[PDB]
Each structure stands twice: as structure tokens, then as C-alpha cells.
Amino acid sequence: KYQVKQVAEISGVSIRTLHHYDNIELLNPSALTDAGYRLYSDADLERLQQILFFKEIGFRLDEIKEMLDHPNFDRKAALQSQKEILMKKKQRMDEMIQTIDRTLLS
Amino acid sequence: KYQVKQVAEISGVSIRTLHHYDNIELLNPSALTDAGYRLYSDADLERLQQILFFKEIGFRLDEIKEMLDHPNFDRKAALQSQKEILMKKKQRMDEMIQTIDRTLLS
């Protein structure tokens, strides 16, 4: 029911980006207009939403492609897994910063 | 005075890695043996050291290539700049984590 331009509007996601999704089979248009323009369902938006969220959380376009279709996917698990990844990525920054403060004492 | 294999030993940096450095003009051997083997000075190690440090701090091989040769380079500035970059990279993680905790309440 929604043309590419409508969703890019609704979501705030770029057309260019949205195209890229279609291209990597990450998010594909459900229908097609009679002139050949791509059409999107609400279930389609329902997916764009998952995408934007995993993306917000820290996932790369590719690992998101996986998660989405996989059967009995474990959300709680993934999120709890990510939270740990982030916690390590953070502590690592903290170390780098410390190292800089130590050096910056001369 | 030091052959590739010696430094890879002294530094703990891989030969493969060290080679890559020579290849991107990041760190180049001073001399050459009579058979054509690459030789490194101490000033050369003196550089490998700067490299390993900027690398530890968070710099990519390329931005390090710059810093090294540039004339009146401002260390204090760079480090203070990096510390900020890191501080933002950190706060960003923190947000992502928060977002996950919020979601993980259902």
C-alpha cells in the first residue's frame, strides 16, 4: 500500500538506504504497482521497524539479515549478548582513555 | 642492525604485520643486507614504538601514517582530541546499552 517515497517519509529512512535493503534481500517490497514501482506492506514496515531497532542496538546490516528470518530466534539472548559485547567495547574505550590520561601527565 | 625476524621478536609484532607497514610506507627498513634482507635502525624501532602507541590509543594505520612525518605535529592536541573521540564513542555505547535494558523489561 506504500510506495518507496511514502515509507522513506514515514520512517525517515532514506530512499537510497531503503533501496540498498531491497538489494541485499534485507527488506523486500511485497507488491508492485502496475507501472513497476515497488510497494510495501505494513508487515513490511513491521520489519523495517525490527531492522531500525537492531541497527540502533549496534548490529551490522548483515547480522540483522540473519536474525530476521531464522526460526525460533532468541531475542532475549541476542540482546543480552549485545549488551555484553557493548560492555566490553566500552571498557576497552575506558582503557584507551586511561592510557591517554597517564601519558598526558608530562 | 636488526633483521625483520629480530624485531618481530623484540616488538612482538608479527612479520606479516611488519611487512604490511613497509608496504604502506608506514615504517620502512633503513638498510639492506648484502643478500637483500631488510634491516632496521633503532630510530626505526623508535618509530615502531610511536606506531604501536598510536595504534593502542585508537588510531587506524592510515591516520598514523600522517601524524608521524608531519612537521610541527601537536601531540598534546591529538591525544586530547582522541580522548574526546573515545569519550563520545563510549557514551554512545552507554546509550545502546540503556536502550537494551529498557527493552529487556518485558
Curated annotation (Swiss-Prot), chains A, B:
HTH merR-type domain location: 1-70
Superkingdom as given in the UniProt entry: Bacteria
Record region (Essential for dimerization): 75-103
Subcellular location: Cytoplasm
Entry's transmembrane regions: none
Disulfide bonds: none
Induction field: Autoregulated.
Ranges of the DNA-binding region feature: 4-23
Residue ranges of coiled coil: 75-106
Region described as Hinge: 70-73
Comment field on protein domains: The central dimerization domain of the first subunit forms a two-helix antiparallel coiled coil with the dimerization domain of the second subunit.
Biological role stated in the UniProt entry: Global transcriptional regulator that activates transcription of bmr and blt by binding directly to their promoter. Also stimulates the expression of the mta gene itself, ydfK and ymfE.
Subunit architecture: Homodimer.
Name the UniProt record assigns to this protein: HTH-type transcriptional activator mta
Gene source species: Bacillus subtilis (strain 168)
Upper taxonomic lineage: Bacteria, Bacillati, Bacillota, Bacilli, Bacillales
